[PDB]
Amino acid sequence: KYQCVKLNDGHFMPVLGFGTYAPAEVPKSKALEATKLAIEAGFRHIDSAHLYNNEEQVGLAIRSKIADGSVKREDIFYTSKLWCNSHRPELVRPALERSLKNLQLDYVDLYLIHFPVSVKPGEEVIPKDENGKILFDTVDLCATWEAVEKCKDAGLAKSIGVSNFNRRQLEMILNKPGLKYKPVCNQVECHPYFNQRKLLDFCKSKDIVLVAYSALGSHREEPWVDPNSPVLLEDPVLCALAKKHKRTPALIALRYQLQRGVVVLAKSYNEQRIRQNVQVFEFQLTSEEMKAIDGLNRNVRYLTLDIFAGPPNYPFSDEY
Numbered sequence: 001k002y003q004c005v006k007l008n009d010g011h012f013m014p015v016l017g018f019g020t021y022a023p024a025e026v027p028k029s030k031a032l033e034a035t036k037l038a039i040e041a042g043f044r045h046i047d048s049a050h051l052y053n054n055e056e057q058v059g060l061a062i063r064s065k066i067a068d069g070s071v072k073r074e075d076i077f078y079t080s081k082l083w084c085n086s087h088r089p090e091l092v093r094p095a096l097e098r099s100l101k102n103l104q105l106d107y108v109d110l111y112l113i114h115f116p117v118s119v120k121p122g123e124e125v126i127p128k129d130e131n132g133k134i135l136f137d138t139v140d141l142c143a144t145w146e147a148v149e150k151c152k153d154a155g156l157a158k159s160i161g162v163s164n165f166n167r168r169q170l171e172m173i174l175n176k177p178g179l180k181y182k183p184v185c186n187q188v189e190c191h192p193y194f195n196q197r198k199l200l201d202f203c204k205s206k207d208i209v210l211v212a213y214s215a216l217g218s219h220r221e222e223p224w225v226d227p228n229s230p231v232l233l234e235d236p237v238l239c240a241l242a243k244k245h246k247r248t249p250a251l252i253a254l255r256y257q258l259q260r261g262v263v264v265l266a267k268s269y270n271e272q273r274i275r276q277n278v279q280v281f282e283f284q285l286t287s288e289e290m291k292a293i294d295g296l297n298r299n300v301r302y303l304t305l306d307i308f309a310g311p312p313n314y315p316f317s318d319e320y
């Protein structure tokens with residue numbers, strides 16, 4: 001269904017969203033078809049990023065569902081993200097305008113700082129030196145946020161937020177001198193094996209929505225995810241609750257987040273699963289079942305973004 005949460009700037013965010021990242025080996029055209037099917041199934045919140053190299057396709061999909069009259073622009077909540085190669089203040093608006101041009105949309109509903117570690121400016125999203133290590137850059141993320149705030153001023157992003165920020169980095173933005181807009185959200189990995197209780201409580205404490213990514217246990221694309229990590233959707237408790245409720249493990253995992261106050265994303269380029277995942281609104285977990293899923297917490301982070309560790313801004317060294 002279309003139920004939403006009110007953000008701290010007064011905009012409304014659909015509580016279920018459609019993830020659009022797919023591994024590099026997935027052809028770009030598949031993003032176009034999956035996003036159309038997502039909108040037909042009921043999805044109104046759509047999550048992309050300049051990193052995903054799909055905004056031309058995702059924009060084509062959204063504007064085709066507008067053109068055929070299925071939805072109007074105001075019904076769609078579209079998220080993009082500012083990548084690490086344009087953290088520098090003077091490059092922030094160029095990057096947003098470049099996403100909008102690829103999308104052929106006048107504005108995004110939500111613009112996020114994608115990841116707090118900066119890299120060398122340029123066309124390459126992961127620039128590398130001769131020994132294969134990332135060419136990091138040195139940027140004041142408070143200066144980045146101010147340039148992101150100016151993007152809201154200009155009406156090019158209706159809301160603004162962050163992703164992959166730990167509590168320290170959230171506090172750096174929240175307590176910045178002259179802050180215009182708080183982040184409306186922190187988009188972070190969250191699933192029953194990494195349920196982010198502490199970070200979720202902290203966001204709640206500052207009127208920041210936690211948006212769960214990798215909520216079904218991630219794409220598991222090598223070399224980003226350890227292939228020896230456990231597979232979330234094989235979990236016996238999730239599978240047992242799925243049987244009990246006549247649902248699926250993915251649907252238990254998404255319902256879990258909805259009942260604990262989290263906005264949840266779900267990626268699928270599969271028509272059946274796309275349509276399946278919107279069924280998260282048709283059933284309820286009992287409080288005893290929520291507690292059983294709470295017990296699944298394992299400290300298994302699927303997406304470490306290890307290749308960016310080293311700089312002070314690497315977000316996952318802190319406890320949360």
Ligand SMILES: NC(=O)c1ccc[n+]([C@@H]2O[C@H](COP(=O)([O-])OP(=O)(O)OC[C@H]3O[C@@H](n4cnc5c(N)ncnc54)[C@H](OP(=O)(O)O)[C@@H]3O)[C@@H](O)[C@H]2O)c1
Nearest residue numbers: 019020021047213214215216217218219250267268269270
């Ligand atoms: N740093 C960031 O901000 C960041 C990082 C990671 C992700 N994200 C966002 O969050 C989204 C979701 O995370 P994710 O891409 O890691 O994936 P995910 O939502 O955790 O799960 C995707 C995987 O689960 C499968 N799946 C989907 N629905 C299913 C169902 N009902 N039953 C069984 N399997 C199902 C997908 O396969 P099929 O496609 O074949 O269904 C795919 O293999 C991303 O697309 C992106 O929008 C953001």
Ligand SMILES: O=C1C[C@@H](c2ccc(O)cc2)Oc2cc(O)ccc21
Nearest residue numbers: 021049051125126219221224303305
């Ligand atoms: O799966 C990953 C690993 C990594 C990454 C993905 C693609 C890429 O081109 C470079 C890095 O960061 C991410 C950020 C995202 O928002 C979504 C997925 C991933």
